[model samples]
Target chain A: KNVEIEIRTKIHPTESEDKVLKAIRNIFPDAEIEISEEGEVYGRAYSLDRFRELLRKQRILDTARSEILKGRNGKEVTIYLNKQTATVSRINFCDENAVSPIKVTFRLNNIPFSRFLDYIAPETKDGRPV
Target chain B: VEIEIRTKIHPTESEDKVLKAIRNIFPDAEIEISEEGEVYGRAYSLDRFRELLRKQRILDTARSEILKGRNGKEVTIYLNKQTATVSRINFCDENAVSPIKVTFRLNNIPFSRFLDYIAPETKDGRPV
Candidate 1:
């Protein structure tokens, strides 16, 4: 589960840029939407907040992220010991749910895709996340 | 993610003991304190949900985690399965948000989600 990463999403058959963009905005306020030159639609939201929950959830499983400074008196990793939120991502997909399957990627800073995904919507790992 | 069945909870444990256990598992669950024997309530928090899985000893459920089926009806499980009116979430911590509540016919889940998660197998490891 601790391997691979990235968000995967799809624009359903019956969706509009305005509608989907607005929906994504509901979950990601600073999100941006764009129309491609060859007839494509894209959206993005990052440097986000409340994503803190993601980190908090990961800490429980002992897989949260730490950013380190290299080649400096030993090494140091930036940490958020208190409750805080943080971001990064891009990907695509297809679905018929007629709603968002958009991969709003980026979870705890360095967790793998599947595990980050698990943290996002965890299921039994090694039988359970217990 | 509903399949098979639980006919009923064993009554060997005192009603108080059962309810207390349920409360410990589901802090937000609204079961009655003095109710004689039934365990019933609504839950919204991911924290509480995790407790339920552990308490019930169904210990495999978690947010965003997938429950993949082995042969007949097991499937990859994830937590985004839960939802709000127009949003998908990893977990629900706030009580104000209306939760994924329900009646049952096996727990609004459509067959499609479960469809891809299953495969037939003779040695799937579950009971007959």
Candidate 2:
């Protein structure tokens, strides 16, 4: 009975969300990637901290950074991690070229005991994938 | 009770001196100078703008005595006593159809100051 972890990441300049998600999916074949208007996260089986570090190391975090350096103002980005859900915020680009790096914050939540077991197994006891 | 006065003045003229002279007529005042050359001052129970306007007319007449050949010199000044604010002296060409556009912020005015002056602070003091 191994516990599964969900990792959420926020990418900035939102314009690059699709591309970044595709790249992450390519690297983590079994991961789930979802994007929303100006905010999104790629979900995978890793601890919250490790997921954030991985995204940063892979330059996926640079997506929003590049956007801000390219002259978009009022950009804010964030990432949220939880057992079953992850979310991110909008990335702003402050300038013309993607040279400036914007700051992004990541947040995490642990699933409650009542819900933990429901998400732990890949398939439900009733023969359906959890 | 917040009043704003807009005025124009020629460059190289000593506006600071005039403002000082005006202040002398009032006792117990707080003044704040802005980067755009506007000044905000606080005073007790005085219609500062009207009083300043009266004094400004007198000053204008005095200025005409020292007038030299026209170098397109024009100055506009704004005074408001309820809020203790003065606009910078601005210059415009003759026959100008519009007043000069100047922007300023009032977020630094404390909540106490607004209450004392019976004025409400704007919501979201940050500039849009």
Candidate 3:
């Protein structure tokens, strides 16, 4: 349960701050968000409830689990999300090729990162979380 | 003919590039960026514009568009911004991509006379 999530995305001159904030919250709600003078949105969240809910709703628990594992480091895991998709309140994992992407990094303090990953995206059986 | 050019500089676009796009079609245009970020300018003639229509072989289409868009000795034509950036003219409606607006103000000369000068109707599938 001790998870710290960091979210950051650049506000392209074409995009408004409100839209960028909405996109960030669409995937990671309950985050403390602030805008830097450099036109970057920074956010911090303590829990992953909304993100987990989205994984279940999108039925991408398996995919999410693999991606999360692939991004794992010693104490943190980082993933990139498509900002355009998030604007429409959807979650789509993307790479640097995306024009402007939301970069999310999850850090585990006391709990095992594996346990946290399972909580966010559990193993699935026949499209059901196991 | 006195031609007026206007197009919005969208937040996604750079001012210099937008000016270049306008110049691509109107090389001698006197351009300005307003307080509201609207790019407005005036071109004394349509010589370069006429050359583009002829070079692109779209005089027939251009003639139809100009005739259809005429109002009280004035004709308004819209060009796609993306195409204009690449030095091409793609006549379009006001919808979809924000377009560069070109308004030709006819003086002394008849609208039909100016039309023949700019984009003449084709004869035998060829510009006469």
Candidate 4:
């Protein structure tokens, strides 16, 4: 039985968010999800490895853009995974000039709601469950 | 100086169709051109670049407002009789989920005029 998790985060107007989501959904298909007006979400996953891989990919992309001095100001990157797909986006900046930073937001679409259990585990030190 | 012009269109628009239109309109123009996605043109020009700049400014303003719902897109056609380069952001919409578009255009305007555009005020209330 494959366990699923749904994570959500703010959605921006670029391909970065979609790229992250597609990468996550490629690995986890049963995760639950939700997204706020600001684009944030919470979910649970069975494979920490998949979650970590998504993070790593996001970092690489962000790093590449940063190295080129092309990153949006107030640079932020997020990764979300749900039962079927993951969505990602940069947050905390209202504009490229970074005039006003907003909180990062996201959502997961179809994973079971019960996966929220892992979120409350006190000893889940890394904030990721295997 | 050389200028590169890029215009983004709805995903449904045919890139080749739009590029063909531009080519027909500027038949005598000489430049390297290309296209991607709904974005139909990547054009480079040396002479008569100012005319191209004016057309670009108009096109950019209309397209950006259509996409982002705001109207501050600006472009300088020429400065000190030379081309200029500038950076700008195009939002998908006020909600931000629609998909953001970023565009860079190499212009032929001078540095001084470029600065004056952002300056508090310009002579005759016109952009420098």
How well is each residue in A2-114 modelled by candidate 4, as lDDT tens digits? 43333444333222334444434454444444545554544444554443354345443243223223321222233212311222322212233221122222222343323
Tens-place lDDT per residue, model 3, B1-128, is: 89899888643346776787888899999998877678888998577788898889998889899988899978998987667876888899876345789999988998878888888876223322
Query: Residue B95 in candidate 2 has what lDDT?
Result: 31
TM-score of chain B of 3: 0.91
Error of 4 at B13 (Å): 18
Q: Give one digit per residue, the lDDT tens place, for model 1 in B1-120.
A: 332211112212233433343344344556532233333454444355433444444333331232222223332222221221122223322231112222112244444443222211
Off by over 4 Å in 4: A1-8, A16-20, A47-130, B1-110, B117-124
For A37-127, candidate 1 gives per-residue lDDT tens digits of: 5325455546434343443444432333212111112221222211001112111122223122444333334544344334333333323
- State which candidate has the highest DockQ: 4
**Candidate 2 lDDT, tens digit per residue, B67-108?**
321122222222222122242222333333212221222345
DockQ of 2: 0.01
Query: Per-residue lDDT tens digits of candidate 2, residues A1-130?
Result: 3334343444533124444454444333355556556454636443333333444454444443333233222222232222101113222223212221222232224434323322222122223123
In candidate 3, stretches whose alpha carbon ends up further than 4 angstroms from where it belongs are A1-130, B123-128
| CA lDDT, every model vs. true structure | 0.32, 0.33, 0.78, 0.33
By summed lDDT, which 10 consecutive residues of candidate 2 chain A come out lowest?
A: A80-89
Query: Model 3 residue B21 lDDT?
Result: 80
Q: In terms of docking quality, how is candidate 3 classified?
A: incorrect
Q: Which model is ahead, 3 or 4, in terms of lDDT?
A: 3
